[PDB]
C-alpha cells in the first residue's frame, strides 16, 4: 500500500490524511465541495505549526508532508488508491452511495474501508462487490497523536483484507486490535456505558459530579473521571452511542439515563458549548 | 478524635490500623484469635520493614508506630475509643453483634464504622441504637497507599457523624468522598460493570483478551485493561459484586455474565490462584 | 341457626388465628348470625382475640350503631379454643394464621383429616399460593383463597381466590356466604397479587422512585395523587399506613413470581425498610409520625 | 401578573382561559382560525351557564368573566402577556415553532408555558433564547374546577420563573406542586401504568373487567376502577402516554399491555366512541 | 360460500387460488397489472402439471380447475365474492387502503381476510365500516399442500365470520385453528425464537451450526435443524418476525439476535441466496 | 474384553445411580458388549435398576429385534453393587445420581481418590455445572459431561460437555466410546441448558404463555405446531410427556444462571406444577389421561 484516499475532510477524516502523510503516504483527499476541502487542509496545517513551534518537528517537514497531500473533489481521484478510507457522515444511505461508487472508480485490489463507529460495516459492504475487501477502521480522535486503532472486520471481511489493514496501521505507526463487527466495538461499548452508569448514580442523589469524578480517578486510577470524560467527549455523542447499543442490542442493559438525555436537549453538551455536567465559564 | 480501634486482623483491618498509626492515632486491633492479632502485627511489620528499606520511612517510625498499635481480642478494648471501623467477614448475621456488642460497651460519643463493600450499613445500623453515628468508611486495598475513602452514609446516619469522619480521613492522609448508601456506592458501581462488560466481549468472540485490554488502555488510557484488571481483583470478587448489584437492584442490566461464572467455577480467579483470563505462568 | 341469611347453604365458620384479621373475620361472620369457632394456640392469644371483638362492638354500642345487648348476642356466637379439633363440623373455615407455607400446609393437612368432607377449606392469604396448600390435602377442589381487607369487619370487599383445582361448586358457596355477610365478592383466578395489591403496590413503590430521583416531595407527591386522580390518600402515606415492610414483601413475592423486572421493589423503599422506618406503625415512615 | 394568553381553544384551552378569567385575569384567547376560537369560546359560555343554571354563580358574574375573554387568530396579540400558555397538539416540531415566534414575539419579560403532558420542556426550551423562561404548566381536565397543576421545570428553568408560576397558579386559587421534567411527571406516571397493570390482570383471565374495577373501588376506595378510568381519560391517550414512559425510560417496566394496543387499533377508546373496557349503550 | 377472490397473484396468493380452484370454488385472481395475474396463472399451471406427471390427478381435473379461476386486474371484481383473500402488501397503508375499497366494493356479506402474519388485523378492521367482518386466514407455503390455517381473529371479528371461514377453510381440505389476534399468532410466536436462540448458543461458541441441527433433530425429533430452517424460511423474514415480536410486545425477551442482524445485513440470507448458516453454493 | 468395540480405547465402565437414566446408561453400554458396574447406594435400588433392565430387554426380546439368549447375555455384563470400589479400575464412569450439587461433588471426590489416574468423570446432569464438580476433584481435565436422553438405550444422540478445563484428550475419548456404543455425540461447551434444552424447553413455556392469554387452546397450540411446524408432538403434549415439573425446573435454571428475564418461567406452568398436575406420569397436566 502506497496511496491513500481519504474521504471527508472533516475533524477525522483530515486528521487521519494528516496521520497518513506524516509517515509518507501518498494522500488524496476528497470531500464535496472545495470550501470544505479548504477548510480541511486549513485544518491540517494550523496542527503542524502547533508541532513546529513546540518544536516536536522542523518546519522543513510541515511542508514536506503538505506536499504528500492532495485536496479534491472529483470522486475519481480514488480510482488509483490502494486503500480508500471514509469518514464521512454517520449516515447509511450516503455511505452505501459512496461506497458503490467507490466500488465502481477503484481498481479491484483496492480497499474500502470506513471510520464509522455506529454504522455496521457488514451493512456497507452489502452495497459493494467486493465484500471481501470492505472494513472498519476505527480511528481515534485525535487521529495523529491517538495510537489505536479498532480494525473492525465485517462478516465478509477477508484474512487478506485484514491483515493488509493491520500491516499498515502499523507502517504508520499505530496499534491496531483485531474486531468482529458488534456494537461499539469494544472500546466504546465499555467506556459509554461507565459514563451512563455515573449519571445514573448522580441522578439518584449518591454523590456529586466532583465526588463521582474523584472517585474514579482516585480509585481506579483513571486520568480523567466519567462526568468530566462524558463533558470532554461530548454529551450528545455519548448520548447517541447509548442510542446505538440500545437499538443494536435490543437490551435494556444500554438503556441511556433519562438525566443524560435531558442535558442533551437543553443544549448542555460538555466542552463543546461550556455546560454539561460542569461548567466551563 | 485520637483513640482509634480496628476491628479484623485481615489485609484490610491490619492495613487500616496501620495507616492511622502511620499519622500518630493510638490504634487498637481486635481478632477472635491471637493467631489472627499476631498474624496481622506480622503483616504490619512487613509493609513498614518494607518501607525502611527504601527513603521511605525511618526505622524510628517503624518501630514509634508498633508502639501505638495495641493488639487485643478483648472487644471490651474498644469501650474508650472515639472511632471504630469493623473490617471482619462479609456476613451480615455476624456484623450485626460485631455491632450490637460494640452499642452496650461504648461511649455514647463513640461512631462505629463498616468497611464493608456489600452489605447495608443502614441494615447494621438498626442493630444498635446509635443509628446516628452508623456510617461506612470504605477503604482501597492497600490500605495505608490507597488516598481514597467513600463515606457511606447509612439512611440515619447524622451529618455531624459524617463530618466527624470526612475529617479525620483527611485528619489521616486521606481524600474522602461523601456517599449516599446505594449498591456498590460509586467505584465498585462503575468499575466492576465495566470488568463485566469485557467479558461479554470476550465470551462473543468479538475481540482477544490481550486486545480488548489493549483497546482499554490506549483508547481510554486506562493504566491496566479491564481482564487484566479483574484478575488483579480477583474474579470471584468481581463476580460477587456483580451478584449483589443485580440481587439489590433487581435490575437485569447488572447480571454477571455467563463465562464469568465458569471461570470462577474453575478456580480460575485471577492472580491470586495462578490464572484468570491470563496465564501466571 | 335460621339466623343466618337462608342465601348461604354453609352454617358454622371456623376461622383459625385470632390476630388482628382472623378476631375482624370471626367477628364479621358472628354479626350476621353464624356460629362461630375461633382458635389459636394458645388461651393468650384466644382470649386477646375475643376482647378485640369486645373492644371493637363496644365502640360500635357507643355511637349508637348497635345496641349493648346485641354485641352480647354476637360475643355469644364466637366460642374461643385452642382444639384444632373444634372445626370438625364446621362447614367452612377460615386460616388467618402467619405466612409460612410450611406452618400453612400442615394445617390444611391437619384440617382435610379432621374436618367432614363437604368442608371448604380457606386461607386469608395475601402472598402465598392457593394451589400449593391445597396440594397438601386430599381435596383440593375445597380449598380456596378469601381475602379479606381491614379493617375484615367494616371492609366490603373479598377477593375470592380460585386455585386451579378450587372447583365451580366450592367457589359458589364462598360466594354466596360472602354475600350473606353483606360482603361483595370477586372472583379471581390464582396469580400474584390478586386484584388490589398487583396494581396498587406498585403505585407505592412507583411513586418512591419519583421521590428518589428528586423529581418530587414527598408532599408534592401524594398532593399530586389526591387531587390529581382524586384519591383518598397519597401513595407515600398509604405506604406508611399500610406498613412499609409489608410492601416490599408484597412487591419482593410480585418479582419472583413473575421473575419481571417490572416489579422489581425500589433501592430506596429497601432502605426505609432495614432503618425500621416502617411508616405509622413504628412512628416513621415518609413521614415523621 | 396580569395578562395572559392561551394558545389552542380546545377542551384544555378553553377551560384554561376560563379559569383565569373566573379569577379576574385578562385573557387572550387564541387560535389558527376564527371558527375554533369560536368554539372555544362557546364552550366556555355553556360550562358558565351552567354554572348559572346551577346558582353557583349570577348571570352578572359570567358576563364579566366573558368580557375578560378575547379571541383572536394572531399570535402577535401575546406580544403583551405576562405569561403565555400553550395547549395545541402533542407535535414536538410545532411546539417548538409556537415557541420560537413566541421568542420573538412577546417582551422578555414574558413567561413561556406548555400544559403538554408528554413533550419535553427542556427541548422545547431550547428552540428560544429564554430557557429560563420556558416552563410547564399542566392543568387537569376539566381546568376550571380541578384544583391541580403540576408546574414542569426544564433544566434551566429559573427558579424566579417558577416562583411566578407558582404564585400564579396559587392566585388563580389552584394547588401547585414542584415537578423536575421526567417522563409522565408525578400522575401519570403513576396512573397510566396502574391502568396498564389492570388490563394485564384482564389479559391473562385473572378477573373480569367488573370485578377489577370494583376490587379497586372498594379494596383501595377509590372513586373508579382503573378500566373505567382508562375508559374516561380515553384509551388512546393512555396508550401515548405507557409508550411516552416506555419510549423515554427505555425500560421494559412500562411497556403498553399489547391488548391495550388492539383496543386502541379497534377505535375502542372508551366513553368518546361509545365503547371501549365497558359498552356505552 | 361459493365464489372468493384473491389478492396478489406473487407464491401465496395463486398457491391460495389453486387450492380454492382444486375444491370447487370459483375463484377470481386479482392483481396490479397483467404481467403479475400471468405469472401467476402459469405458476398455478406447473404446479398442476407436477401433479399430473407424478398421477396424482388427471389432466382433466387440472382442466377442470383452471377453468375455474379469472385473472383480473379489478378490485372492483370482488363485487360480488363471498370471500376476498388478500395476500400482498406487508405494508400497513396499502393494506388499509384495499381493505377500504373492498368495504365499498363488495356486497355487504362479503367477508375480507388478510393472509398476513405481520400486521394487525384488529388495524386493518378499522380502516373498514364492517370489523365484524374482517378476518386474517394465514395459510403456510406452499398453500395447496400445507394444511393449517390460523384463522386469526380481531377483537372485533365476530363469531359468525369466524364460524364461516372456518366451515370453508374446512371444505378446502385444511385444518383451522382459532387464534385471537396476538404477535406472530401461534406458529410463528413458538418457532421463530426457536431459531433465534440457536443463533445465540451459535453465537456464544457453544456449538457448531452443525451441531446445534443434529442436536435438535436427534434430541427432539425435529425433521429440520432451527439454522437450516431459518436458512430455509429466508434468514430476512425470521429477523422481521422477531423484530415484529419486540415491536409489538415492548419485551426484550424476544429481541434479536445481534448474529442473525449481520447475516441478513451481508445478504446471507439462507437458501434463496445461497448462503446462510450453510454454504449451498 | 474383546467384545468391545475396537474404536473405543475405554474397555470398563461404571455407572452410579441405578434409577432410570442411569440404568439406561448401563444398558446401553452393556448392550454394545462393555462390561458394566452399575452402583447403587443400598442392594434395593440396585435390584430396581436390574429389574428395569431386564424388562426393557424382555420387550426387546418379546418384538423380536433380539433373542432371549443376547439378553441373558447382555444382563451378565451388568454387575451390581453397592461398593464404590468398584469403580476404581473403571475406564470411564458415569454419575446419574440425583440433581444436587453438594452430594455430586462427594461423589466425584470420592471417584478422584478411588480410581486410577486414567479413569475420566462423567455427570449425565442436566442442571449443574461441570466445571463446578470438576474443581472438587484434583483431575478436572478428566471430568466432563454425558448428557443422554431418555430412553437411553434407543436415543441416539449424547451432549457432550466441555468443562472449561475439560482436555482435548478427555473429550475425544469420550466422543470415541460415544460413537463405539451406537451414539452420535455433539460437542459443546458448557453453557446453561446446552443445546436442547436451551432451545426446547422456553418453546414449551411460550406455548403456556399463548394459552394463559386466551389466544388459542391447547389443542390448537398443539396441532398448530405439529401441522405448522412439522413437529412430531405439539408442545403443551411434550411438556407433559417430559414432566411439567421438570421443564419448570430447566426454565428456573436457565433464568438463574443467565439472570436474563428472557427464560423466566410462566406463571401458569409454575401453578400446574403445584397443583400436581405434572403431566403423563400424574395422569394430569395441560391435558388428561386416562
Given amino acids: 500500500m502506497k496511496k491513500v484516499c481519504v474521504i471527508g475532510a472533516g475533524t477525522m477524516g483530515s486528521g487521519i490524511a494528516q496521520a497518513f502523510a506524516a509517515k509518507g503516504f501518498e494522500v488524496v483527499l476528497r470531500d464535496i465541495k472545495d470550501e470544505f476541502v479548504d477548510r480541511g487542509l486549513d485544518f491540517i496545517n494550523k496542527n503542524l505549526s502547533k508541532l513546529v513551534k513546540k518544536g516536536k518537528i522542523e518546519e522543513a517537514t510541515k511542508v514536506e508532508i503538505l506536499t504528500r497531500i492532495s485536496g479534491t473533489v472529483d470522486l475519481n481521484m480514488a480510482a488509483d488508491c490502494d486503500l480508500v478510507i471514509e469518514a464521512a457522515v454517520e449516515r447509511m444511505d450516503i455511505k452505501k452511495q459512496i461506497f458503490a461508487d467507490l466500488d465502481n472508480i477503484c481498481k479491484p485490489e483496492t480497499i474500502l474501508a470506513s471510520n464509522t463507529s455506529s454504522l455496521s460495516i457488514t451493512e456497507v459492504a452489502s452495497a459493494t462487490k467486493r465484500p471481501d475487501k470492505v472494513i472498519g477502521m476505527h480511528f481515534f480522535n485525535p487521529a495523529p497523536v491517538m495510537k489505536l486503532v479498532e480494525v473492525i472486520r465485517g462478516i465478509a471481511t477477508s484474512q487478506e483484507t485484514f491483515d493488509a489493514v493491520k500491516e499498515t496501521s502499523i507502517a504508520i505507526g499505530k496499534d491496531p486490535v483485531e474486531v468482529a463487527e458488534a456494537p461499539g466495538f469494544v472500546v466504546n461499548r465499555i467506556l459509554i456505558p461507565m459514563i451512563n452508569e455515573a449519571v445514573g448514580i448522580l441522578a439518584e442523589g449518591i454523590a456529586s459530579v466532583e465526588d463521582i469524578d474523584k472517585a ?35 437490551d435494556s442493559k444500554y438503556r441511556p439515563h433519562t438525566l443524560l438525555k435531558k442535558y442533551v436537549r437543553a443544549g448542555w453538551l460538555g466542552r463543546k458549548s461550556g455546560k454539561g455536567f460542569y461548567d466551563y465559564s
Fill in 216 to 250: 474514579m480517578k482516585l480509585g481506579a486510577n483513571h486520568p480523567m473521571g466519567p462526568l468530566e470524560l462524558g463533558d470532554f467527549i461530548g454529551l450528545d455523542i455519548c448520548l447517541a452511542i447509548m442510542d446505538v447499543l440500545y437499538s443494536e442490542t435490543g
